[PDB]
Design a protein around this ligand. Structure first.
Ligand SMILES: [Mg+2]
Lengths: 211, 465
């Protein structure tokens, strides 16, 4: 797996013209069953690579239960992998074994960074869509029939947004100058984690909430 | 909208709170001696309906309408009018669920006026749109003949005689809004053209300079990777505690002096390209590319917006012209019949001007007997008063305005035509509230309500005679 050509495949080209998978539930549930016991095991099989990278790409085409459990998948996998690399690097172990796991660590981080990039990009797209045509979505008071579903969509995307930013806060505790060696690739990784936040901050009621 | 109460506070000849009630919905008639305040009652009604040109209210300013110019204790001038709404067919839009509509205009010294509907404040466009819906427009009236202006309706230019028929048809409120729309679109068009040439001259040159330094930044990032590989190898090889041994045993035996001068020749390009290009130009070019694309999409949508508005007003002009012709035929027929009934062995028609179109202006042509008058300047003041009154009543017979204000339309009519006008307002032209100021007894003796006006102690009073 590589980062830069996939990142310029997502960013420069069109994003909402991605193909639609015929049955997402069985493939994402067996992905869950792979990832309920091992968060790093997408690497070893390229069908799981392409399966994850295109079950993330169709994020405005799923059902909300599937969306929330995919967000919990991404947050749980990032939190477990960040805790594992933190427990490995903070210990007094030699540089040889952590250097042997550092291509696994760096390519797993490329995978998860691309997934977090596309989820935060589609999430800010949907939040800009639901907050553009509305008046005030900071609270659920003084609503209507469709407005209650609108503000419930607001709260559920903001809650999975909070879970994703929880995963991001859990990521950046590790010394990423150990993981990412040179400053172009480190700049690219921190930039792909920080760019969708800086485009998310355009939304006026997103900065109005507190968490 | 039959007027039910008129409350005048601090107006021209009215120093106190004068409340005029008991208005009959068919025919009200105001009388009194000279200098009593009748035309000031009509000026209060014109002022509460909204005036721009203060020469029809007979003032040179707005503080000239307050009592003794506001320098006699009454520093405010407020006019209140109350309309009944038992008939919902002539009701305005949105106000159907209110059986009484009150409109008040206030002016204090120094500043300008302010309007309130039913106690609650409102700007002037709200009350002007309220009164332009039951065709009670004072700025271009088809219901207001002020004092001494009854023998001068036939002296009007053909655009004004066209505008009366236009107000009867319902398209004057479209015509002034269309002219305002063309003026506003021209001003926003030259503003948008200035913005387009500013975009062409000032943005895309700097955008292509940004693209130039973008590709130089990809070259600088290639040298960046060159530094963080080669200089790291260099500082590792002069540092020689086991990791440096492991990164020595892949490149065993690299020459020192060539690597040192290669590091120097890389750092001189680095100190050049450090002051050449900023390291964060990729997010900057992404930001300005998104801004330029959204800007051009906005300009395309603005141009398509102007095209849609222009094609829609060009499509509405045809229905305006068709309803103007359909109004003009019925109005000139009822004009001829009402003038034949008022003055016997006579006739009058509304004709488009010589060679031009109906929508360019209209002219009155008068027949007395079997001969056509080539010019209506040779007619008397009484005949011209009868032609003007018959034109206003033909406009009533098309679509009756609720309030017809007549300030001494009988000053040039004789004692037969005055009684005939009073009878024809009492009997024939039912369907409007007439507020007529007269001094001839043959007009207000055929009245359903009579208000005397008197001057006492410095102020004016209205007594229900
Ligand atoms: Mg008078």
């Amino acid at each position: 797996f590589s980062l830069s050509e996939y990142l310029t495949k997502f960013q420069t080209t069109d994003r909402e013209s991605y193909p639609r998978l015929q049955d997402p539930s069985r493939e994402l549930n067996v992905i869950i069953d792979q990832l309920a016991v091992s968060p790093e095991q997408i690497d070893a099989s390229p069908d799981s690579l392409e399966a994850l990278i295109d079950l993330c790409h169709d994020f405005p085409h799923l059902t909300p239960k599937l969306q929330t459990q995919l967000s919990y998948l991404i947050s749980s996998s990032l939190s477990n992998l960040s805790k594992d690399i933190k427990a490995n690097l903070s210990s007094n172990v030699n540089f040889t074994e952590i250097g042997g796991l550092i291509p696994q660590w760096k390519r797993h981080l490329e995978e998860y960074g691309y997934l977090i990039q596309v989820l935060l990009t589609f999430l800010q797209d949907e939040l800009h869509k639901v907050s553009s045509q509305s008046t005030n979505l900071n609270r659920s008071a003084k609503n209507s029939k469709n407005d209650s579903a609108n503000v419930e969509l607001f709260k559920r995307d903001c809650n999975q947004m909070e879970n994703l930013l929880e995963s991001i806060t859990k990521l950046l505790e590790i010394n990423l100058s150990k993981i990412f060696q040179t400053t172009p690739e480190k700049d690219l990784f921190i930039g792909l984690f920080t760019r969708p936040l800086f485009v998310l901050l355009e939304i006026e009621p997103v900065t109005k909430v507190s968490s | 909208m039959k007027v039910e109460e008129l409350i005048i506070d601090g107006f021209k000849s009215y120093a106190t709170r004068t409340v005029i009630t008991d208005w009959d919905p068919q025919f009200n008639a105001i009388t009194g001696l000279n200098g009593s305040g009748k035309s000031n009652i009509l000026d209060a009604i014109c002022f509460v309906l909204g005036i721009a040109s203060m020469s029809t209210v007979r003032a040179s300013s707005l503080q000239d309408l307050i009592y003794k110019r506001g320098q006699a204790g009454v520093t405010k001038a407020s006019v209140t009018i109350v309309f009944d709404n038992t008939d919902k067919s002539n009701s305005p839009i949105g106000f159907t669920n209110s059986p009484q509509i009150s409109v008040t205009r206030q002016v204090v010294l120094g500043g300008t006026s302010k309007y309130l509907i039913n106690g609650h404040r409102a700007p002037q466009q709200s009350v002007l749109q309220l009164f332009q819906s039951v065709q009670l427009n004072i700025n271009n009236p088809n219901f207001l003949i002020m004092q001494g202006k009854i023998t001068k309706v036939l002296n009007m230019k053909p655009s004004e005689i066209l505008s009366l028929i236009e107000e009867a048809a319902g398209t004057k409120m479209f015509e002034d809004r269309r002219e305002k729309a063309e003026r506003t679109m021209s001003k926003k068009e030259t503003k948008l053209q200035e913005n387009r040439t500013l975009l062409t001259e000032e943005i895309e040159p700097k955008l292509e300079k940004l693209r130039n330094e973008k590709r130089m930044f990809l070259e600088f990032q290639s040298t960046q990777t060159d530094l963080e590989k080669t200089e790291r190898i260099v500082v590792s090889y002069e540092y020689y505690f086991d990791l440096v041994r492991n990164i020595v045993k892949q490149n065993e035996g690299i020459d020192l002096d060539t690597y040192r001068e290669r590091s120097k020749q890389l750092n001189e390009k680095f100190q050049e390209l450090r002051k050449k290009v900023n390291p964060n130009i990729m997010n900057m070019i992404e930001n300005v590319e998104k801004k330029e694309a959204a800007l051009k999409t906005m300009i395309k949508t603005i141009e398509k917006d102007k095209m849609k508005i222009q094609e829609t007003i060009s499509k509405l002009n045809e229905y305006k012209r068709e309803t103007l012709v359909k109004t003009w035929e019925k109005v000139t027929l009822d004009f001829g019949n009402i003038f034949a009934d008022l003055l016997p062995n006579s006739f009058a028609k509304l004709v488009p001007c010589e060679g031009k179109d109906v929508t360019q202006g209209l002219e009155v042509k008068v027949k007395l007997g079997n001969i056509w008058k080539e010019s209506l300047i040779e007619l008397s003041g009484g005949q011209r008063s009868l032609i003007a009154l018959s034109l206003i009543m033909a406009l009533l017979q098309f679509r009756p305005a609720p309030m017809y204000i007549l300030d001494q339309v009988d000053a040039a009519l004789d004692l037969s035509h005055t009684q005939n006008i009073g009878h024809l307002i009492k009997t024939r032209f039912k369907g409007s509230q007439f507020i007529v100021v007269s001094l001839k007894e043959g007009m207000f003796a055929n009245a359903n309500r009579v208000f005397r006006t008197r001057f006492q102690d410095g102020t004016s009073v209205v007594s229900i005679m």
